[PDB]
């Protein structure tokens, strides 16, 4: 009926040009800049060369094949109701997931109208609120979400929920675990949940780098986050400058496979043995920055005595480290010596912080170990810092555009970073108003996402901290309980998405909780019929960001990752055009909430009479965009490339700290009250505390915690091959990092094109099985051959996988990405082997430490064998 039109939109894998014709998406591609209307890029002159980025953006694999997700046959087609669920009769809680237990999920549901679905949910909401109160209504989306600032969970979800309930299952700082519960006590950075700032490090590195140690870092795979492959050319520049790349990772990751000069494969949970031996070498050879340490460290003398083995009787030698990790002593010492004499950047994690190693049983000591090494070598000075090569791009930090974490239309200052700046720009206290919550606050009631199963099935729990405790170093130490004083236990559960079986810990427990009799009602507001969705009583179809209007900036999260758009080669602001009408009978989350608001008699307050596009324009006017173009002009162009700011003075991450002067970067901390005269780290002493003062206070107050000592020491990982009794039955060490070809659950399954990728899933007898990588030696010992179906198991469950025999793992170590989107039990749900590929069924649910209430997934002991075909209904 018409011609092809090129529109714009974006995703968690980067911005794209969307070609549409007759209401159908033809293709989605990376973006080409038009030098006639798009501002010039930045340039960096270093070591006799001029570096400038390509005039184009890049995308991730899962974004390249995203069209197959939009038009997926597993897309929820219309509102659905569980047949065995009668609101006014037998609710049959025990029959939730019955379809799944008989390998026929869809058979459990029947089609219903939007009007009837919403009436049923409203009747439940009102009944529960008047009988138990809003706290009885549990709700939680999950960590990630379709791209788009206005419709993002911190925005639309919170604006509505805050006006309706509710008890939030606040998220644990998954991405940051070790840095959050451990590193924070050592160097502060609470506002970044333990991660360091990275401002202007690219130019610093191009001019001074001689070596980069990628520790638990796979920049190519993770891109930091949301940045496609923007940093690929940068490591290419470094490589051509002669910079050496060393990788320390149990698995020879994708970046290592591409540019590694040397690769170390430590056994799971033993990285801190390597950091202690490196420090030991530096102390014995006097090869570190003593001046820097003398001025910027606290408790270093005592720590040094520990490293030297004076206090515990065990010198942390490279030989001692080899016996612990399996990495040759000579190589550890060689790296140590080279690191000391060359300008070396420590790329801990893919972002500059993070790293799979941080969310493992040794996560706390790994993070502190990374800080210790960077500190000893004088981080902040030219040629020495913590930099993962993904951030640090010289973008205009002075131009302001909100990341999704700043709240959008919710203005929630306690559960989003709206309070820093956006809330004040977006709301005027006259014509438009925020939606605060008096329940999702410390003095109200929330439960830990990691312990939802225990709260539902046990009816009681006690823990430390509330979600992301970034306010101050000690906020995570505050004690909470469920049910909270005066509040009600959960009666209803409103799920937004359903990825937990593949993303949390020892996940069979999440499947078991749905059938508990205390759960009177479960609603799932999702996009695809997968994961946990088939356990709900009512299912509401939401649409992707390609079916609604929104606005956003390439990789811009902001908030707990201030100015992270510096992950990209250009700051790109784009209008997310509604490319097509919603698929099936789905609708945007905002429209769903608008419909509920109407039935709850709060429509005016929630919507303020605005549709998604009206909110986008208001949002737009609250940014610095009006300085360059009007809404009308922006809407027409579709995207804007922020101009370069050539003359701004460079402020390299931590240089101010290294030089003992006032903080001068654009970072959001430390807060003035956490510093003396605007100098020093957020820590009490303002220095890097090898003996954390906050933890010393905590332990002296009576909170004894063996696995989180105030002093950074070699605490044996509780789930490692030589320190866990479990190793006898399950000798193999498994690490389960983020999926290479999917943004967590968003990409896998759904009959998407990504399932045809050779290294994603392997088709065997018509079924595409998840992959587990095994060293040829371990495979041979078990009669396992490439492509064979194997069973990975431990006390927590069984998972059927396709084996990939490789040399990319030290013998004894196995690897399998987490975040499988498919939950496909061979028997009863939560009690049998899964063939979908949910590796997190096997990971430990035990907290990193007694009070460090984070996930320790990446250290799991398992055993594998050729699958005999049984369903193993024994869990």
């Amino acid at each position: 009926m018409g011609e092809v039109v090129r529109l714009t939109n974006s995703s968690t894998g980067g911005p794209v040009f969307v070609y549409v014709k007759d209401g159908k998406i033809i293709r989605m591609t990376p973006m080409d800049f038009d030098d006639a209307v798009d501002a010039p890029s930045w340039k960096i002159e270093a070591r006799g060369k001029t570096f400038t980025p390509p005039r184009k953006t890049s995308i991730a694999p899962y974004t390249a094949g995203f069209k197959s997700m939009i038009y997926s046959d597993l897309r929820i087609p219309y509102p659905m109701k569980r047949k065995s669920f009668d609101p006014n009769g037998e609710r049959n809680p025990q029959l939730r997931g019955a379809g799944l237990s008989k390998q026929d999920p869809w058979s459990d549901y029947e089609r219903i109208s939007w009007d009837e679905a919403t009436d049923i949910v409203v009747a439940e909401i009102n009944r529960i609120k008047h009988a138990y109160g809003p706290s009885a209504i549990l709700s939680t989306p999950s960590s990630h979400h379709m791209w788009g600032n206005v419709g993002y969970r911190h925005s639309t979800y919170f604006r509505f929920m805050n006006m309706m309930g509710f008890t939030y299952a606040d998220h644990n700082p998954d991405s940051w675990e070790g840095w959050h519960w451990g590193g924070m006590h050592m160097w502060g950075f609470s506002w970044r949940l333990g991660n360091p700032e990275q401002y202007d490090l690219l130019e610093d590195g191009l001019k001074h780098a001689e070596m980069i140690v990628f520790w638990s870092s796979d920049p190519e795979t993770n891109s930091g986050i949301y940045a496609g492959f923007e940093s690929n050319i940068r490591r290419q520049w470094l490589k051509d400058l002669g910079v050496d790349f060393v990788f320390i990772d149990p698995h020879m990751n994708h970046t290592a496979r591409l540019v590694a000069d040397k690769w170390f494969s430590p056994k799971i949970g033993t990285d801190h043995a390597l950091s202690f031996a490196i420090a030991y070498t530096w102390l014995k050879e006097d090869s570190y920055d003593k001046e820097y340490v003398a001025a910027n460290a606290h408790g270093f003398e005592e720590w040094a005595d520990y490293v030297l083995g004076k206090t515990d009787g065990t010198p942390k030698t490279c030989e001692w480290a080899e016996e612990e990790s399996g990495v040759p002593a000579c190589e550890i010492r060689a790296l140590a010596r080279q690191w000391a004499k060359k300008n070396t950047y420590l790329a801990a994690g893919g972002l500059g912080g993070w790293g799979g190693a941080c969310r493992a049983s040794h996560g706390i000591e790994w993070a502190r170990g990374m800080i210790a090494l960077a500190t000893m070598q004088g981080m902040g000075k030219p040629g020495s810092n913590m930099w993962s090569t993904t951030q640090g791009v010289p973008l205009d930090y002075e131009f302001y555009f909100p990341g999704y974490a700043e709240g959008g239309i919710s203005g929630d200052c306690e559960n989003s970073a709206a309070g820093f700046k956006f809330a004040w720009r977006m709301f005027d206290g006259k014509t438009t108003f925020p939606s605060p919550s008096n329940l999702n606050t410390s003095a109200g009631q929330h439960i830990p996402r990691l312990k939802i199963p225990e709260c539902i099935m046990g009816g009681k729990f006690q823990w430390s901290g509330k979600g992301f405790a970034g306010g101050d170093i000690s906020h995570q130490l505050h004690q909470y309980e469920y049910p909270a004083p005066g509040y009600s236990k959960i009666k209803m559960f409103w799920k937004y998405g359903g990825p937990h079986l593949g993303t949390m810990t020892a996940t069979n427990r999440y499947a078991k909780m749905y059938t508990h009799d205390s759960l009177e009602f479960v609603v799932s507001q999702s996009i695809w019929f997968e994961g946990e969705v088939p356990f709900a009583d009512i299912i509401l179809p939401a649409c992707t960001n390609f079916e609604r209007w929104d606005i956003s900036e390439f990789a811009n999260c902001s908030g707990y990752i201030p100015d992270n758009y510096q992950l990209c080669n250009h700051r790109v602001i784009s209008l997310q055009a509604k490319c097509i009408e919603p698929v099936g009978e789905s609708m945007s989350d905002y429209e769903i909430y608008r419909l509920f608001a109407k039935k709850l008699n709060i429509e005016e307050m929630f919507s303020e009479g605005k549709d998604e596009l009206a909110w986008c324009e208001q949002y737009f006017n609250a940014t610095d965009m009006p300085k360059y173009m009007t809404w009308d002009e922006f809407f027409k162009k579709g995207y804007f490339v922020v101009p370069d700011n050539p003359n701004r003075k460079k402020t390299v991450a931590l240089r101010w700290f290294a030089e003992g002067r006032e903080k001068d970067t654009p970072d959001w901390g430390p807060r003035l009250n956490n510093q003396v005269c605007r100098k020093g780290l957020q820590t009490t002493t303002g220095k890097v505390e090898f003996i954390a003062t906050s933890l010393k206070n905590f332990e002296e107050q009576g909170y004894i915690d063996e696995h989180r000592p105030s002093m950074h020491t070699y605490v044996p990982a509780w789930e490692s091959q030589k320190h866990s009794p479990l190793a006898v039955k399950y000798p193999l060490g498994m690490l389960s990092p983020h999926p290479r070809f999917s943004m967590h659950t968003m990409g896998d399954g759904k009959n998407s094109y990504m399932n045809y990728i050779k290294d994603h899933r392997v088709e065997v007898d018509g079924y595409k099985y998840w992959i587990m990588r095994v060293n040829s030696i371990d495979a041979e010992a078990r009669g396992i051959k490439n492509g064979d179906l194997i069973r990975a198991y431990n006390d927590r469950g069984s998972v059927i996988l396709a084996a990939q025999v490789t040399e990319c793992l030290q013998p004894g170590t196995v690897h399998s990405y987490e975040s499988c989107a498919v939950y496909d039990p061979l028997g009863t749900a939560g009690k049998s082997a899964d063939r979908g590929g949910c590796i997190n069924i096997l990971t430990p649910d035990r907290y990193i430490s007694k009070y460090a209430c984070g996930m320790a997934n990446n250290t799991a002991l398992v055993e594998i064998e050729k699958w005999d075909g049984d369903k193993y209904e024994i869990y």
């Binding site: 080409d32 390249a64 190519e220 494969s265 010596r337 045809y756 050779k758 290294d759 040829s776």
Partner: protein, 274 residues
């Protein structure tokens, strides 16, 4: 009469599969009258070959994106009975209609790049997105592979045979299965990473990695390569054809030598303690 050519740098492939996802995006749900029917899920018009070499801990892996070679002396055209034709710009295309019902076409390929589509009952394969190249509206003026790469692996060009020939010699570009004489127009840079092998090792002196040791590789008595060990005491001689070689090492006046057999496999001699 300018022709199309593609250059693929093996040393730069990371196997993110942005290409592959790009074909599917372009062909799985779309039909292009005159060029091809929709692609069948599971087909690999763009087939990224994976190859691991060596053994832990001195192993490596390289990838080889493999589309249609659109060779100048194409066997399909020759034995396709008119169901396959060659355009002046070099693109080799299967006639979507004339090819229907002929599974035999698949066997006319020495490279095995065509796949049988069950629903359409026809052979299908790389079209080099001719439908896009033939449309001025497609601003990128290049195929979806090349455009979707985030790793600078592809170099897509339209030039004269002479210009391409010159480029081949300067960059040492190679094609797959040259001996067949089909003359691919898809060239590979650093192909040795995928087709050849290496020998490597780590030299230790008094227990520590030795940097600067002189290493020489000899075949039949004559030097074939040489290098000095890095700070990990390692060296790596790549691009080796199968056969027997001798490695000679000299560190601190201390010598060591040993033979190595390369048979479609790369070898790690391990730690050499001097």
């Amino acid at each position: 009469m300018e022709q199309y050519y593609m250059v693929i740098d093996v040393a730069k492939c990371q196997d993110c599969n942005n290409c592959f996802m790009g074909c599917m995006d372009e062909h799985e749900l779309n039909e292009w009258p005159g060029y091809t029917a929709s692609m069948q899920r599971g087909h690999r018009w763009m087939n990224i070959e994976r190859r691991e070499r060596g053994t832990y801990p001195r192993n490596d892996i390289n990838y080889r994106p493999t589309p249609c070679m659109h060779c100048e002396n194409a066997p399909c055209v020759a034995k396709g009975n008119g169901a396959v034709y060659q355009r002046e710009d070099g693109i080799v295309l299967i006639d979507p209609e004339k090819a229907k019902g002929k599974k035999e076409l698949l066997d006319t390929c020495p490279y095995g790049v065509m796949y049988w589509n069950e629903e359409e009952n026809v052979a299908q394969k790389c079209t080099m997105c001719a439908h896009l190249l033939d449309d001025e509206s497609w601003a990128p003026k290049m195929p979806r592979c090349a455009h979707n790469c985030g790793s600078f692996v592809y170099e897509f060009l339209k030039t004269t045979p002479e210009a391409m020939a010159k480029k081949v010699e300067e960059e040492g570009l190679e094609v797959i299965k040259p001996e067949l004489g089909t003359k691919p127009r898809v060239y590979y840079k650093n192909l040795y990473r995928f087709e050849k092998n290496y020998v490597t090792a780590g030299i230790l002196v008094q227990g520590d990695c030795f940097e600067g040791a002189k290493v020489v590789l000899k075949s039949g008595g004559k030097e074939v390569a040489s290098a000095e060990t890095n700070f990990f005491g390692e060296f790596k001689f790549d691009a080796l054809d199968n056969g027997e070689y001798t490695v000679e090492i000299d560190a601190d006046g201390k010598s060591y030598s040993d033979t190595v057999v390369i048979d479609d496999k790369s070898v790690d001699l391990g730690f050499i303690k001097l």
